[PDB]
From Swiss-Prot, chain A:
Dynein heavy chains probably consist of an N-terminal stem (which binds cargo and interacts with other dynein components), and the head or motor domain. The motor contains six tandemly-linked AAA domains in the head, which form a ring. A stalk-like structure (formed by two of the coiled coil domains) protrudes between AAA 4 and AAA 5 and terminates in a microtubule-binding site. A seventh domain may also contribute to this ring; it is not clear whether the N-terminus or the C-terminus forms this extra domain. This is Dynein heavy chain, cytoplasmic. Residues 287-536 are annotated as: AAA 3. The chain holds residues 2093 to 2910 of 4092 of the full protein. The lineage of its organism: Eukaryota, Fungi, Dikarya, Ascomycota, Saccharomycotina. Cytoplasmic dynein acts as a motor for the intracellular retrograde motility of vesicles and organelles along microtubules. Dynein has ATPase activity; the force-producing power stroke is thought to occur on release of ADP. Required to maintain uniform nuclear distribution in hyphae. May play an important role in the proper orientation of the mitotic spindle into the budding daughter cell yeast. Probably required for normal progression of the cell cycle. It comes from the Eukaryota.
Amino acid sequence: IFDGHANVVYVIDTKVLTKESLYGSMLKATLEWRDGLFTSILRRVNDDITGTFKNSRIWVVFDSDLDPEYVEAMNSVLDDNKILTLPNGERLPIPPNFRILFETDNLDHTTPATITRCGLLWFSTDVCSISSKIDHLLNKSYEALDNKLSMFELDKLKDLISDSFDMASLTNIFTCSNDLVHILGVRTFNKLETAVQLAVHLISSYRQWFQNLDDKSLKDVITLLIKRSLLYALAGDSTGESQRAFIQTINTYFGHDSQELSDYSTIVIANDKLSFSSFCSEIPSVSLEAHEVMRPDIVIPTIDTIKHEKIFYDLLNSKRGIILCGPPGSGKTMIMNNALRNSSLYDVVGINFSKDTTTEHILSALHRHTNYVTTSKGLTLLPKSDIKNLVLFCDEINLPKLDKYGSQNVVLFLRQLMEKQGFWKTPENKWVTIERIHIVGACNPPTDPGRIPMSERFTRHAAILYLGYPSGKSLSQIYEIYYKAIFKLVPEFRSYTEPFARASVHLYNECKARYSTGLQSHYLFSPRELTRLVRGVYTAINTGPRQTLRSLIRLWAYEAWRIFADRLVGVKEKNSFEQLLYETVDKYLPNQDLGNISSTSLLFSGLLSLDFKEVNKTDLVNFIEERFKTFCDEELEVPMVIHESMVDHILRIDRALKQVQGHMMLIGASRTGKTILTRFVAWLNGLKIVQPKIHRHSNLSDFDMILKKAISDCSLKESRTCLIIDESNILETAFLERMNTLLANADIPDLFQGEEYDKLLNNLRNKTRSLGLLLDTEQELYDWFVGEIAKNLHVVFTICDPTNNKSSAMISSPALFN
Amino acid sequence: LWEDVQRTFETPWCRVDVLLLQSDLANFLRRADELPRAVKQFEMYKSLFSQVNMLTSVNKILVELKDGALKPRHWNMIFRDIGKRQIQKNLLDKLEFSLKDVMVLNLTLNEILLTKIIERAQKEFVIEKSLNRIKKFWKEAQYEVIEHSSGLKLVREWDVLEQACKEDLEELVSMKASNYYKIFEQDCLDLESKLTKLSEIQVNWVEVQFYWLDLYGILGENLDIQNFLPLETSKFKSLTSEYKMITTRAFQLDTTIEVIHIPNFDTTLKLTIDSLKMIKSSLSTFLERQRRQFPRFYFLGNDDLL
Ligand SMILES: Nc1ncnc2c1ncn2[C@@H]1O[C@H](COP(=O)(O)OP(=O)(O)O)[C@@H](O)[C@H]1O
Ligand SMILES: Nc1ncnc2c1ncn2[C@@H]1O[C@H](COP(=O)(O)OP(=O)(O)O)[C@@H](O)[C@H]1O
């Protein structure tokens, strides 16, 4: 404005775009030099004169943190000679009108020579007050909503908003908020924007009911809403009881003249009455079916469940990126899935981030539900495909590892998507704007080993929500529902549902308390363990015959052993768990008819009969001996000995293999028979065994085609294979991440394209038609392939001592433990 | 009904498939109960039921034998060792022999010999399938070429097909170790020769394209150096013409594997690459001579001085 010179701006994120994409590169077939973004825009500005550049000022900013290598091609540009030094072709001159910017916060990987050559500007403090920031945010929201909504109602609501909260008490609120423990916390100056955006959006959501009520009640409800929004945005990372403390705090400091904010406060607005008061204690009952024990799309309503559902839905409707925090057993992924799939406005894209997930993988994931359209405002676009909003669920954002100079590149890519609402097309070298594709993610606290602390930029731009273990009582009701569903099979003991759930919850709490990482770093217990054991009980009952009370208690205890104690070391810990089960049963069960309940005194297997039941020791020993004799007859002849411990391990492996997910972690020491006992048990059920063949130069491709052919055999012909993977087999990190993905997910996310995708599609066609199945829905074909691979694949891990660093990485991996 | 059964036996070995056979046997079993009592009292029902139950018993062995593993030599030795009989060699080569001749071998009792024969056939089939891949893969898989300054047809993204041929060699040389693969040993060696000639052809095409485009940015457009090296420029132009003829021949050939079948091809590639190397050496000598003619040129570098 001062000079009347036009402004030219180009925002580029460094770590997102590599050198051959930023500056271009020669082709290693004809040395044809590709342009690259920076060189292309420089060419457009300099060579082309149709655009106005003599009169204008051209400005280029590198928002992402910069490394010397990128400016190693710019140091000459940074030097006083003022000429671009291309690896090939002529050297592009640069005019004084072509200014260059760099923006960052870390100077560890910057040469002092660059500091000398550049002009350094430092910000040692905040640039604005809290109140001024808030006022600017309200002005931004007002101008964002004015061009869409009615102006008079906007005037009324914005006047009431300005006269609703005063900065004086807000200062006390924020100061006390700083005096509170946060998880991945950032300063309140960052969460201000989230709070104000959420508040303004949600108050705009109730526009239709703002004309027929008294202005006093409107002020009351607006204060209620602003209090709720400040609570949820500011303290969304709080423990939850500290959330109650902050509720009381803001109730005290903020004006009491309006309707007061409560813990479980909500408004059920309906066009029948002026329903705007506080509503609470509205949990509904849900009746389910027996077979619905394991469908990963099952959630049970609780007060915390519905509250988190509503908050997440509100903030997605607030159009803001959201990031989730919680313990590994907090249940984030599936509660999020249940919150998102049932929605009539949002589409699920569940993508699991890896140790390194390239950006074009995310680009393809978007392609599967988006398209490229060309308009005048943004030229090329990448908007939605259908009408419902598209939201991608990135998973474990802290899992990817930084580069050699720090910072995770595709994390900054996500920052680019959710900050500037678009990115740069690397071959097209033109900016593309997205149309409201929201970003959702979940990550464990960085206090968990193997999690990199997250950059404050990304956390600031999104909002944080922390959800922990839902107390002890809530687990009691949810597993009481699970147990009534599981007792639908056997109506004899319907009223005994409560004692089982109470005992299970108490046992889980005692397992958490007794065993911790102080002994070793895998004593983690989660409600996932309880869900697994209730599934085990369900499978045992469904496969087993009618059970008396004593039989039901015995099988419950056996599944408790197989879920909890099988990960325990020593015998002192084992007998401690044993006696723990004694007092748990005695407290939570009136029936005293069981005998010894120890591992040796429990012998439950379905290998000796069609029905899963307790069986004689001697008969099982004889059966195993006969099968081993058959092994010596036909299978590998090794001097082998049968004992009680290996028989117990055979029972455990058979139970694990009969599970729907035969993903097994077998941890011990070498020369113990594990890698051949697994073969023995696999042949007992007549499976197929594949062992990878590795070498000193075995790349990723070897395991790639071995795993692909194993998957195809499990799918094309339903071979029902079992996979044995050893510590020797794991040496690189590439197929490490491949195995982690195939475990956490169920399919291959990076090879099912092109000819592979087409052969998968036609193979599904052929198999469905041969089996007489009419299934032809492409997405449902993908889901059925997931089901087939889940139903037919079982992988077991044979590992050396956990003290090994590779073994430590194996046991400490999130998916492998999960 | 019995006519359908006799038709199924008389249908040739290649003309019967396990899925169609299973469907036909299911139809026979379903329609067996629909026969009136008079037919069942007659010997037709007895014969048909015995034959269909017999075929049901030998369903799995037929599934094992119906894979692509088995070659006519395997069936020849099956008939010689088991049935002590032979089928006309012309009919045996095309795999057209009645299922009755298959069944008179008593597949159930002699299942072990057929099982080991099928095992050897599958050991050879592991090789055979990989053979088929290259067979049809490189059959076409031509090199995508474009136009540069109205000149030669330079291949685009050629490194991917280069690597494809390289891995095809790796797999062809690794499949040479097998228990039952001595059938196509002459074919295997023929494929090895074809792909080795192609490998040398490719490792020289990469070099000749590289050097030809290097010197093409040096000669052919700027007449100053062309006059400075008249003999070298003339040699480069002649090599350009002959290599243009070679590229046109190989590109309208439209068959990558058949490229070796063009006579005086590898020799042309060898002489071309040797002449290009000599031309580049002479050019470097001229560059060094000019640099000695003017000491300050050593700062400018090769590209700037050119
Ligand atoms: N409200 C709920 N409804 C159903 N299951 C729940 C609920 N809360 C917790 N769970 C159980 O607790 C377990 C914890 O899951 P978790 O391992 O935290 O998933 P992730 O870490 O992938 O988000 C889940 O397996 C789930 O079955
Ligand atoms: N229960 C057992 N009785 C006898 N020998 C055993 C037993 N368990 C393991 N072995 C010995 O271990 C070898 C088999 O290797 P294995 O123990 O399966 O390796 P790892 O336990 O490291 O996977 C055999 O040579 C055998 O002598």
